[PDB]
Amino acid sequence: SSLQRASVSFNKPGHIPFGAVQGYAPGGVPAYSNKHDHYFSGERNIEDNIFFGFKYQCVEFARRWLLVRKGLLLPDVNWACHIFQLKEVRDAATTESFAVLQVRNGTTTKPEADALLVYPSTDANPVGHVGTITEVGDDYVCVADQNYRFHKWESSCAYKLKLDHRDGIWTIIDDIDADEIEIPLGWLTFPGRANRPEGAPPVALHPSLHFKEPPKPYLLRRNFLPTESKANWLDMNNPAERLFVEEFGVVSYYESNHEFHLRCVAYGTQLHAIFMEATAQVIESDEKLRLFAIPEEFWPRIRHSWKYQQTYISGRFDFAFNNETGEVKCFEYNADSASTLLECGLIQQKWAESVGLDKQDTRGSGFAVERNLKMAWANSGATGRVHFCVDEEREEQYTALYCMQAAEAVGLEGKLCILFDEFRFDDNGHVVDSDGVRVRNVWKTWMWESAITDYYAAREERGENWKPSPKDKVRLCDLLLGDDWEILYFEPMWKVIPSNKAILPMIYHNHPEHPAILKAEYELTDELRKHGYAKKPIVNMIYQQLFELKKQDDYYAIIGGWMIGDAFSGTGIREDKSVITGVDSPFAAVRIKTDIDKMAEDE
């Protein structure tokens, strides 16, 4: 019991883990959990060179289901909804094309089982959706799919939809969520092909239907000569974009193929899982917590943080990438607070528009950022007012205002706080703001170390019998390390752990397979002496292996990879001919070369 405000996590109640079997469609076709809406793993489902789809999206089910159930291969389709515009599929054995029949919703045709129901594209759901209709009642249809609902099925389908019948017309309506009604376009039948017998084994596919090995990934430094350029290209009204300009006063950017971007989504999301696992191990060990130099006095608190709050908004990986070898290696996870968010999720596209580089065939590397900040916030567990707290530093202010825009977009109320005078103590020692409201949610750039130092400093300046009264000005340590441990902090206190170089030998030991992990040890080893090592200490030592930074046009380049909530949501670059300090280094635009040009990340 004990915990007055609810613990929060991104594992929502109802939902089952990514990849757990939710249930089976008739014929023994399993539906896997995609964790939650709009989650994207970056990982392909391939058995025996048959590319089914992405782990686990809605089309992936459609396609898997069609093979097992009818012996027919659904062709490549970028957006679910485009399925309704298919005229033909293909035969698993002969490859001969095979005529689907398109049957529109809201006509005089009743729907029937073993059809692919297809929802349209909307301003509110841009790729649409595809399910299988497994049964058709008098007044409903049953649907089997992936990536719409996340529960353990209580039957052979995911859900039931209304089937309306008035004046001769049949209309499947999805009004389950009464404030997000959708009407499907219609459904594809496959007239002439019987279901495969139930408990028949799967057909083997003609090898000319094997997945074409994708192109090897590349990230390549390009030079462009803009024909059209815009004098003022940022929106000076928007406060975020203003503080940027007053901070920073034939061109260049990087081009990645779609495969490189997929490789980052997959490596990103997996590294995040790996760091989180590691972070649990540290949290449960007195020894490891002393190693990370967390003072013993803060263990109850950090441990509490870890139990109480399993949500978080941002963290940034630092990668190197080598074009010839294909290798992506991760140096570190700056999960407490990273610069570069506004640049990545806005300024670089804005810029690209200014030099006319947003042609049809490429996209802004951080297109997802905006939409995923909203989803982090919407699912963060924060409710009521959120205080965004920063220093007299513009870089932090535009970082903050950018997450406020996202916060305010999803129903949260926001208040930017520069330093600590917006706050006061009330009659009972609690921290409150200028309108008299008790603090409950705090997003901040202020670092936990800075707080821990201010706490130790504070400890004499007033003493140890001291108890806050309205007389006392609020300090950092009161705003982040006061007696109210149930304030949600964004980036929570446990985020110091995965940010700490001491986690690096632990993630190496737990998962040395991972193509992105670098060998790291607590002690020098003969093998590190051969490969080359860096001796990186902490807040004794850790030793990590070296990776070559390869140059293009003489520039070294480090890649930043954002986690926004649990989404890997984009990449940016900083480059330098000498040393990428990224306090003072030029940021570089990353563009992805790809309705024939749209992706799966949008689902």
Q: Under the rule (CB under 5 A), what is the footprint of Br ion?
A: 5, 339
Return the residues of window 199-228 that contact Cl ion according to CB under 5 A: 200
Q: Quick check: helix, strand or coil at residue 145?
A: coil
Using Cβ positions, the residue closest to Br ion within the complex turns out to be 5
Based on CB atoms, which residue is closest to Cl ion, 279 or 337? 279
Q: Least Å distance between CB 53 and Cl ion? A: 4
Q: Which stretch binds Cl ion (CB under 5 A): 51-59, 69-77, 457-465, 554-562?
A: 51-59
385 is an interface residue for Cl ion by CB under 5 A: yes
Based on CB atoms, which residue is closest to Br ion, 440 or 593? 440
Based on CB atoms, which residue is closest to Br ion, 289 or 390? 390
Q: Which of 75, 384, 532, 586 binds Cl ion (CB under 5 A)?
A: 384
Q: Least Å distance between CB 575 and Br ion? A: 14
Q: Give Rg (Cα) of the chain.
A: 27
Based on CB atoms, which residue is closest to Cl ion, 190 or 547? 190
Task: Determine how many CB atoms are found less than 10 A away from the CB of residue 406.
Answer: 24
Strand partners, 364: 591
Strand partners, 6: none
Q: What are the strands of the beta sheet with 328-334, ordered from one edge?
A: 328-334, 314-321, 556-564, 567-576, 587-588
- Phi–psi pair at 515, nearest 5 degrees: -55, -20
318 is an interface residue for Cl ion by CB under 5 A: no
Q: Which does 53 bind (CB under 5 to 8 A by kind): Cl ion, Br ion, none?
A: Cl ion
First to last CA, the chain: 38
Which tokens in the block code for residue 330?
């991760």
Based on CB atoms, which residue is closest to Br ion, 22 or 339? 339
Residues 357-380 as b or e (16 or more Cβ within 10 Å = b) = bbeeebbbbbbbbbbbbbbbbbbb
- Which DSSP category does 125 fall into? B
Q: Least Å distance between CB 557 and Br ion? A: 15
Contact 216, 259 (CB under 8 A): yes
Q: Which stretch binds Cl ion (CB under 5 A): 59-67, 228-236, 322-330, 591-599?
A: 59-67
Q: Tokens 């390549």 correspond to what residue?
A: 220
Q: Least Å distance between CB 384 and Br ion? A: 8
Based on CB atoms, which residue is closest to Cl ion, 407 or 559? 407
* Binding-residue pattern over the window 428 to 467 for Cl ion, x denoting contact by CB under 5 A: ----------------------------------------
Q: Least Å distance between CB 200 and Cl ion? A: 4
Distance between CA 538 and CA 372 in Å, rounded?
32
60 is an interface residue for Cl ion by CB under 5 A: yes
299 is an interface residue for Cl ion by CB under 5 A: yes
Q: Least Å distance between CB 117 and Br ion? A: 39
Which tokens in the block code for residue 21?
């079997």
Q: Which does 339 bind (CB under 5 to 8 A by kind): Br ion, Cl ion, none?
A: Br ion
Amino acid (one-letter) located at 358: D
Number of H helices, E strands in the chain: 13, 34
Distance between CA 90 and CA 97 in Å, rounded?
4
Based on CB atoms, which residue is closest to Br ion, 236 or 538? 538
Burial tier of 553 (Cβ tally within 10 Å: 0-12, 13-18, 19+): exposed
Q: Which stretch binds Cl ion (CB under 5 A): 33-41, 53-61, 484-492, 547-555?
A: 53-61
Using Cβ positions, the residue closest to Cl ion within the complex turns out to be 384
Binding residues for Cl ion (CB under 5 A): 53-54, 57, 59-60, 200, 299-300, 384-385
